[PDB]
Structure formats: structure tokens, C-alpha cells
Design a protein around this ligand. Structure first.
Ligand SMILES: Cc1cc2nc3c(=O)[nH]c(=O)nc-3n(C[C@H](O)[C@H](O)[C@H](O)COP(=O)(O)OP(=O)(O)OC[C@H]3O[C@@H](n4cnc5c(N)ncnc54)[C@H](O)[C@@H]3O)c2cc1C
Ligand SMILES: Cc1cc2nc3c(=O)[nH]c(=O)nc-3n(C[C@H](O)[C@H](O)[C@H](O)COP(=O)(O)OP(=O)(O)OC[C@H]3O[C@@H](n4cnc5c(N)ncnc54)[C@H](O)[C@@H]3O)c2cc1C
Lengths: 546, 546
């Protein structure tokens, strides 16, 4: 009853009846973070997202919160300083999301110029730690001799190995970070509508005072009045600005594509995130990263033109990434045939982040990275509060976003294990396996409680376990799942990181969702056909010649 | 009687009668440092220098021992690490030479791209300190607001001023560092001859086993046999190698010229070394540095061709440097007319330092910087010992150059003031003004004692004070002064940093030296004519149109 299709319909109607203080365009991490800070400050807030929440770039990143340690090679210390400081801030407000996962960075001497050597990587990590106040911490950096490295990863290229550095950085489920931000703002009374696209502006003089939005489920278009409209559409930032035709819009964005590939862990069983120069002397570094029972690689950097909602993996990208990986791991012999899942996204690159008011009144928050996200929203709020005070003489609350914990993260950021262990008991008590109880505690954090409540008093959907049925029900009832892909792709890691177990639950999931919505056989068939398209896409069936 | 023209004549003869274990070519800081380590290890050592000691690049530097903090902008941490570590090592073995003189580095925002800003300069200085183990020290870095900077230097460009950083680095009298190295090696029994040029090699098969050297005072050429010959001729490194004609000698050096200009302090009274971007956006930084009662600027960087012994200041160099200085100090209005002294030198640039054995057996130690000098000689000794052991089965002592104190520096590197204060008393007791006693204590360190002894039992030369006569006598008797320029230029700061008091003692100095040597009226006139040439050169009389 909290955040579902019904809630959405309520919000759609409410947004047409009352003038909002702020209308947000874009339901990615940027807009999600602004929405959370606005609602918590006591501001009539609305947010429209044409796709599912996080379906943009916020669910296509490398899935970590890091500080960009490579930028220290050119001495961009302020950029690196701001980012690593936010690393701990985000951990503090979303303890169940970003988790510490020390990086292993091997150095070679037989591949030409490198980002670091044995000596400079040590200095780099010490500075990295200093800027992050990690220097004393247990996550304090250190180095490893070639032998010690080969211990952790005996399949790594031995030729040229000079050793490695091990420093702290965070693995992070980006889609979840966005959703569990959205859910907070909702809990704080904001109107949040997915599947709604901004398609034109409402004007008073030359000033924007609302938007024409198309309900993408009914195709009906409504008017939404608002005192302030802020554009947080990521790589779509210019397309939204260009809805206004007053003057030549100078482009502020120039998005590049990056892809990622997933393989079963056994084929390349890195025990921890591994980062290194490509060996191609192209000025790039690539990862190999464990997640559940897979490792995944990227990434990739190409100029892009075309559909922004569905960027695709090309054989050029696969050749490059697999060329890099097989060079670094001489005996893994990985090919397209081993790829279980994949994904591609567009970087919202400027020309870090930018906050602008344009002549027509439109506010735009662009660029940046997921890690910077709540620092970006803070700047936006500072200006939004000022503008509300100025132009509408309306006062608002001052909050401390660095301490405002999002949905499911309302617990001591220092006690993740104790909180998971404690919640895992309630789950076993709700009637679930200890394994599933723990996974759910760690994944949804505090929200696991609600999931367990639903598990205790419900009958599992046909073809699904009680644990799985509880999660799906929760997603449908409190995470605005509208399509099976939202759930299998975005609310969970089924598609990307559990592909070998997807086929067993795919249909049962669609059945239960179509059941919950009361779909026609027409709609259920349309939804099914679409899911298959998304799966075939991630599976790279076309590149495999299937 | 210790180190004079007589000593030199003795060495010239000894070098023709006994086969040396090592013959060094070049009496700059590099060869001086190798000579000190060789002799202290118990190695029959000889060194020939065609000019006066340090008359090469070692007396034409910016006269400081620093770590090249600018190199941190490109993250060359190992290069910067080695240098700043040696900073303290050299201070420890020559406590009377290099002294701490915190740098003031102002930052501007209105001159385009800069090496640092307010934020990065702080990070840079903290790293600089860390690498040097200065972090806790009283010399720990810090920043200053524009106002605080304007306090120290009210004549600095105020427009664009964002503040400044203050970190530790050392002022250093390079010529003295070289001489007080030479004097140690002498004291440890090495043969050291100035005014002697290596002009060809002595061969056994295709192997060098000595050199033909020309006594530049008599023009007689002698043969010197040696088991090992090492080339430490700075920017002259290729010219020495090319004495052998066996094959196409690929150039390893490519020297560039840099100049410095001196003005009376009153015209630009920086209270401490000041370093900044030129504002020209040429990727360069310039100093303004106090020394005695002047400030001096540089420096400069031009490809060079011509006579290596006498590189000259050009109006192009003066225009550039004065353009930079007047831009940084809007109201100083400095022109050539205000220049009291100047000097130019050639950087021994490779293509840091290099140690090679070539096919004909010649050893070459090139590149580097004054600060690296004893670390460079250590590497050279490691190889020289090995070679002596190998090819001649001769064993040698192992010494710790990081703790071997040079001439006049045999005291606790932590007690400079107490040592100066204590020595200043002996000088007053020897019959000298307290001012002169202190200056002499600080300048010659422990050697001041000998100077005072000579002052107590001698009559001042005509036209010179007792203090001045004692120094000159010491230079002649124990610092191998052969020409007035050695003394006025190199043993002391008369020419460069006391130009307004030179004319009063110039003639009296020549008289006393000609007297001490028993010059003909022919020679004294030749020496006089030459000194005038050197003075006219530093005075830039030709550029001034005089
Ligand atoms: C390959 C790759 C790897 C990356 N790696 C990392 C990393 O490891 N760590 C990190 O911090 N960052 C990383 N980044 C960048 C980071 O993911 C992005 O900066 C971040 O997700 C941008 O968030 P956003 O909210 O601005 O945009 P998005 O998430 O793209 O959302 C914009 C939203 O607005 C919607 N929208 C567009 N037009 C309209 C409209 N007219 N009406 C209504 N809604 C609309 C879109 O559907 C979309 O959901 C990576 C990026 C890429 C491409
Ligand atoms: C403008 C400028 C500023 C600088 N600033 C600094 C600084 O602030 N700090 C720092 O550490 N470094 C600085 N450097 C560099 C530093 O001064 C040099 O690296 C150092 O002095 C080189 O010492 P050297 O002993 O190798 O050479 P040199 O001092 O040049 O000596 C080589 C010697 O061998 C002699 N010689 C040549 N041929 C023969 C021969 N055939 N027979 C006998 N003898 C011969 C020469 O006369 C000469 O005395 C600067 C250099 C320049 C040009």
C-alpha cells in the first residue's frame, strides 16, 4: 500500500490539483537524491521519470563507490578529495548498500608506460587514504610482492609482475541506492511517478511554471504546475532543455558509452575487485570484479550517437574488453560464448558536476558521478531554498543530508554485521532459510523486516519459493514494480548476476505480476515479449549469432 | 701549507710517479663528492679540473638545495622523494653550508592555468613534508590569506592574490659546498689539481689506463696512470668522452642555459625566498630570493650552443626575467640599470643522473643536480669498489657518506647557532669585530678557527681589514686560490652579493695575491685585465651599452 501502482495513480492526480514547490525531471540517483533532500526539508515535491526508476545511467555503472585514485596521476587532488570524502558519507546514510571491498591493483614492468609503479602506487594509496581519513583505519593500504599476489590470484599474468597495492573502495548496487532513495522521499510525502515523460513546458511570460507530462502507461498527457522545475535527466539533460525553443541551445553534454560483461566466477575467480592498466598503452585501466557467484569486467569508452534509452553492446566493445582480460589472465581463455549477461550505459559528461539556472527559469543539475550524488543534491537544495525564499517568500527547513539515512538504512553504519545477523533471525522466525534471510537482510537492510512480515502471513506464488514470493510482493507493494524487468533487473540481481537461475523463475514471476495487476492476456503477452527482448539483449544473442 | 699552489705542484709531480687507483675528471660538486668518498675509503685518488674548482655549473645554480616540489604536479613522487631525502643528508654533513629558508609561494586566480591553487598547494606541501619526514617538525608547512601575504610582501601584485603556501627548503652557497668537499678529500690524502685539463687518453689495447693532462699554468702536458678513470665533467661530459675516436659517440648531454640577476635588496626587499608562476602561461616558475643585502632572481631556460666555459647573459634573457619580475611586483620598476651582478650556467641535462661504463673502460657520472650529489657519488663508489676488487683484487673500506662530515662542518648539524655563537667569541678574542667573527663562523663553519688563528698572528695586508686579510690568507694557504676571481667570486660572495663594496677592496686583494705569489708585473697586469673582464661581464656593461 505504501509505494505501488495505486500510489502512483494517486500522485498523478494530486500533481494536477495542487501547485508544487518543486517538480523534478529524472528518476535516477541525481533526481532521487534531490527528491529526498527536498521532501525532508518540507517542500511540496514531485518527480517524474519516463522509464523505471534508475533505468537510466544509474543502473549501468561499474557498480562501485570509489574516489578515482587514477586522477592522482595528474594531481587532481581536489576532485579526488571531494569524492573519497563522500564515499564515507554515502556509506553512513545507506549502510546496507555500499560496502567496503578492498581493491587489488597489480603493477607490471613489461608493458610500457603505466599509471603507477611499485613506488608511486604506495604514495598514491597513502594520499588516497589521507584524503579519506582512512590512514589509521583497518582498511589502511598496503603492498604485495609478486608471490603474495599470485597467491590471491594464481591465474594472473606472471610475466612482468612487480607486485600490487591494496587499498579501500566500495562495491555498490547502484539501482538499489536509487530505489532506496526514492522510497525515503516517498515516505516523506513526495509525489514520485515512474513511466511519465516530461514532453513540454508551461509558461508564464517567458518563465517556466510547470510541465506537460505524458503518462506512459495511458498515453494521456497532463499539466503539472510548479514554482520550480529542475532538470536531473542525466545524459538526457540537453534534450530536456531543448524542449524550449527560445534560442540556440549550446550543448552542455557529450555522453560516452561504457559496457560491462559477466561470466560465471569459476571461469575467472578473482577473490576481490582487481584493477589494472590494459597493457594496450591506451591510457586506460580495466577491472575484474566479483559479485555473488560471478566476476564481471569493464569498462569501455566510445563516442555515442543514437537512442539514449537503449545503448547496445557491439562486437567492437567485446573484442576490446576480452582482448584486455585474456591478456591479463593468460589461461582464462574467455570468449563471447562465456558471457552470461551484460549491460551498457551513457556517461553524462559535461562539455565534475554543474548546477545552472537558465534564462527561461529552468534549473539543471548535470554531470557528476553516482558517488557525488548527495553532495550534488545539497548544492541544488541550497539554491532551491534560496529561490523559494526569494521569489515566493516561503521558508523551509534546513537538514543535514550527510546524516539523513535513506530507506532501509536506518541503523548504525558501523554495525552492518550485527544488524544483518539480528535480522536474519527474524527471517528464520518468519519461516525462511537462514541463507535467504541473511541475503535479504544484507540486500534490503532494515526493510528486510517488512519482507519477513509478508513471508509470515502469505502463501508463496506458484512456482516461486516463500522467500522469493515475499521479495516480489514487497517490490510490487512498496517499490513500484510495474514490469517484470523492473524486478528481475533492477530491484534484484536476477538478470545480471544470477542468470543461470533466471529461467526457473522467469515465468512464475511474470505470472504473479500479471496476476497482481489483473493484466489482460494481451498485456501479459506484450510484457512477456518485452522481457524476452531485454534478456536476449543482455545475453548478447545477436552477437552470438543466435 | 695545507692546500695551496705549493700543494698543487706536489700533487702534479706525485701523479706522474705513482699509478693511481682512480683519476677523476672534473672538479665540480660531482667530482668533488666522488673524490671525498674515494679518499675516505682508502683509495689512491687524483682529480683534475681545468678551471678553478666549482667554476663550472656548480657555482652558477640558483643556490639552494630544494626537492623540486613542482614535479609533484605530474606526480613524479620518486624523483621528488629522493631529492628531499638528500636535502637533510647534505645539511647533516655540511651544517655550515645549506641552511633552512622557508619558501613563500603565492597563488593567483587571474593569470590562467597555474601549477597549484589554494587547495592543491596545501596537499602538495603536506606530501612534500611527508616524503621528507618534516611533517611533525617546526618547519611544517602552512598557508596564508592574501592579507597575511601582503603583510610579508606589501609590494606583491595584489590583483588576483588568493593566498600563499610556506614550506621548507634550503638556501645554499654551491661554490662553498664544492670547495669544502674538495678540502676534505685533500685532508684525506687525495691529489687535487685545479687549472689542469684532460686532453687525451692513455691506452692499453683498447682500454684507457690514464690521461694526458695539460698543466694550464705552465702549458706543459703530463701523463697520469690510473686503474680507473671517471668522467665527472658536468655539461662537458660528451666532450671528454669524444676524446676517444673509436666509434660514433651518441650524445648523452643536451645542456640548456639559465641566468640570474642581482639587485640591491631595497629595490625589491623580499623577506624570504619567493617562488611563483611567471604569469606568462609558459609552464615556468621564477624565484625572488634574498641573500645578504640583495635579492636576486631567476631563472631561465634556453637551448645553448657555443663556449661552455663562458655562457653569457643576453638581452633576451634580461627582458624575459625583468618582464616576469615587474609583472609580479607592479611597483618595483626594475630595469637593467638596477642590475648589480649576474651570472649564467649550463644545466647538464641527460638525453635524473646516470652512471655508465663505456666500451673503452671510461666511467661517466652525468646529469643530476647539486642536491643529489652525494647520493650520485655513492653509486659511483659502489661500482668503483667492485671494479677495483674485480680487476685488481684490491679491497677497500666501506664508509657511510651520509654521515661523513666535510671540511668545516665537523659539528652537530642540530647546533648551528650555538656553534656560530661559540666561534664568534674566539674571533672577537682573535681581535675581530663581533659582526665579522659571526659572518666568518657561519660562512666557513669550523674552519673559522683557522681563520682566527691567522688573524691573531698577522699584520693586515695593505688596504684590507684584518678580518678580510685573514680570509684571503686562508684562501691562498688552504683553499687553493690561484687568481683573484677565485677568491672574489667563488671563495666569497664579494662579486655577486657585495658588488657595492667590491671596488674598495679589489685592488688591495690583487696586490696581496700578486705579492703572495711573487708575480711579475707582466702577470699581475694579465690577472688584473682578466678580473676586470669578469667584473664587466657580471656587471653586464655591454648590455648596458657601456
Ligand atoms: C559504463 C559506466 C560506468 C560508470 N561507473 C561509475 C562508477 O563505478 N561509480 C560512480 O559513482 N559513477 C559511475 N558512472 C557514472 C554514474 O553512473 C552516473 O554519473 C550517474 O548514474 C548519473 O545519474 P543521473 O541521475 O544524473 O542520470 P540517469 O540515471 O541517467 O537518469 C536520468 C533519468 O531521467 C529520465 N528522463 C530523461 N528524459 C526524461 C523526460 N523527458 N521526462 C522524465 N524523465 C526523463 C531517464 O529515463 C533517466 O532515468 C559510470 C557511467 C557509465 C556509463
Ligand atoms: C641556471 C641553473 C640553475 C640551477 N639550479 C639548481 C638548484 O637550485 N639546486 C640544485 O641542486 N641544482 C641546480 N642546477 C643544476 C646543478 O647546478 C648542476 O647539476 C651541478 O652543478 C652539476 O655539477 P657537476 O659537478 O656535474 O658539473 P660542473 O660543476 O659543471 O663541473 C664540471 C667540471 O669539470 C671541468 N672540466 C671540463 N672538461 C674538463 C677537462 N677536459 N679536464 C679537466 N676538467 C674538465 C669543468 O671546468 C667543470 O668545473 C642548476 C643549473 C643551472 C644551469
Amino acid at each position: 500500500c505504501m509505494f505501488s501502482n495505486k500510489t502512483r495513480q494517486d500522485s498523478i492526480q494530486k500533481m494536477q490539483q495542487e501547485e508544487l514547490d518543486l517538480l523534478i525531471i529524472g528518476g535516477g540517483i541525481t533526481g532521487a537524491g534531490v527528491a529526498v533532500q527536498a521532501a525532508a526539508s518540507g517542500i511540496k515535491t514531485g518527480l517524474i521519470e519516463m522509464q523505471d526508476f534508475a533505468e537510466g545511467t544509474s543502473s549501468r555503472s561499474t557498480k562501485l563507490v570509489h574516489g578515482g585514485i587514477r586522477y592522482l596521476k595528474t594531481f587532481d587532488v581536489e576532485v579526488v578529495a571531494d569524492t573519497v570524502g563522500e564515499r564515507a558519507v554515502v556509506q553512513g546514510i545507506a549502510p546496507h548498500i555500499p560496502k567496503p571491498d578492498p581493491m587489488l591493483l597489480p603493477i607490471y614492468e613489461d608493458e610500457g608506460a603505466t599509471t603507477f609503479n611499485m613506488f608511486s602506487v604506495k604514495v598514491a594509496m597513502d594520499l588516497y587514504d589521507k584524503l579519506a581519513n582512512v590512514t589509521g583505519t583497518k582498511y589502511e593500504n598496503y603492498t604485495l610482492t609478486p608471490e603474495e599476489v599470485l597467491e590471491r590470484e594464481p591465474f594472473l599474468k606472471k610475466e612482468g609482475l612487480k607486485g600490487a597495492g591494496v587499498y579501500l573502495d566500495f562495491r555498490n548496487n547502484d539501482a538499489r541506492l536509487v530505489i532506496d532513495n526514492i522510497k525515503k522521499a516517498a515516505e516523506d510525502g513526495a509525489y514520485l511517478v515512474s513511466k511519465m515523460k516530461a514532453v513540454g513546458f508551461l509558461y508564464e511570460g517567458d518563465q517556466i511554471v510547470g510541465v506537460k507530462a505524458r503518462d506512459l502507461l495511458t498515453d494521456e498527457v497532463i499539466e503539472i504546475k510548479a514554482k520550480l522545475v529542475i532538470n536531473t535527466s542525466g545524459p538526457w539533460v540537453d534534450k530536456v532543455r531543448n524542449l524550449n525553443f527560445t534560442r540556440p541551445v549550446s550543448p552542455k553534454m557529450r555522453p560516452t558509452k561504457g559496457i560491462h560483461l559477466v561470466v560465471d566466477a569459476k571461469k575467472l575467480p578473482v577473490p576481490q575487485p582487481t584493477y589494472f592498466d590494459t597493457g594496450k598503452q591506451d591510457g586506460r585501466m580495466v577491472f575484474a570484479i566479483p559479485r555473488e557467484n560471478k566476476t564481471y569486467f569493464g569498462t569501455t569508452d566510445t563516442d555515442y550517437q543514437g537512442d539514449f534509452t537503449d545503448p547496445k553492446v557491439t562486437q567492437e566493445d567485446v573484442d576490446y574488453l576480452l582482448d584486455v582480460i585474456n591478456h591479463r589472465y593468460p589461461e582464462a581463455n574467455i570468449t563471447l560464448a562465456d558471457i552470461e549477461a551484460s549491460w551498457a550505459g551513457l556517461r553524462p559528461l559535461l562539455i565534475g558536476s554543474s548546477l545552472e539556472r537558465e534564462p527561461d527559469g529552468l534549473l539543471t543539475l548535470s554531470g557528476g558521478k553516482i558517488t557525488d550524488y548527495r553532495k550534488m543534491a545539497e548544492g541544488a537544495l541550497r539554491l532551491i531554498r534560496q529561490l523559494l525564499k526569494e521569489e515566493y517568500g516561503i521558508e523551509t527547513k534546513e537538514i543535514d543530508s550527510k546524516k539523513y539515512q535513506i530507506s532501509g538504512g536506518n541503523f548504525d553504519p558501523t554495525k552492518l554485521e550485527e544488524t544483518v545477523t539480528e535480522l536474519a533471525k527474524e527471517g528464520v522466525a518468519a519461516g525462511l532459510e537462514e541463507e535467504d534471510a541473511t541475503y535479504i537482510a544484507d540486500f534490503y537492510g532494515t526493510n528486510a523486516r517488512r519482507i519477513f512480515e509478508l513471508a509470515k502471513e502469505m502463501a508463496p506464488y506458484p512456482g516461486l519459493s516463500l522467500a522469493e514470493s515475499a521479495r516480489l510482493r514487497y517490490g510490487l507493494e512498496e517499490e513500484m514494480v510495474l514490469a517484470p524487468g523492473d524486478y528481475l533487473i533492477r530491484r534484484t540481481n536476477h538478470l545480471l548476476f544470477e542468470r543461470d537461475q533466471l529461467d526457473e523463475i522467469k515465468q512464475p514471476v511474470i505470472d504473479a505480476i500479471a496476476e497482481y495487476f489483473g493484466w489482460t492476456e494481451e498485456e501479459k503477452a506484450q510484457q512477456t515479449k518485452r522481457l524476452e527482448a531485454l534478456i536476449a539483449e543482455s545475453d548478447l544473442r545477436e552477437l552470438k549469432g543466435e
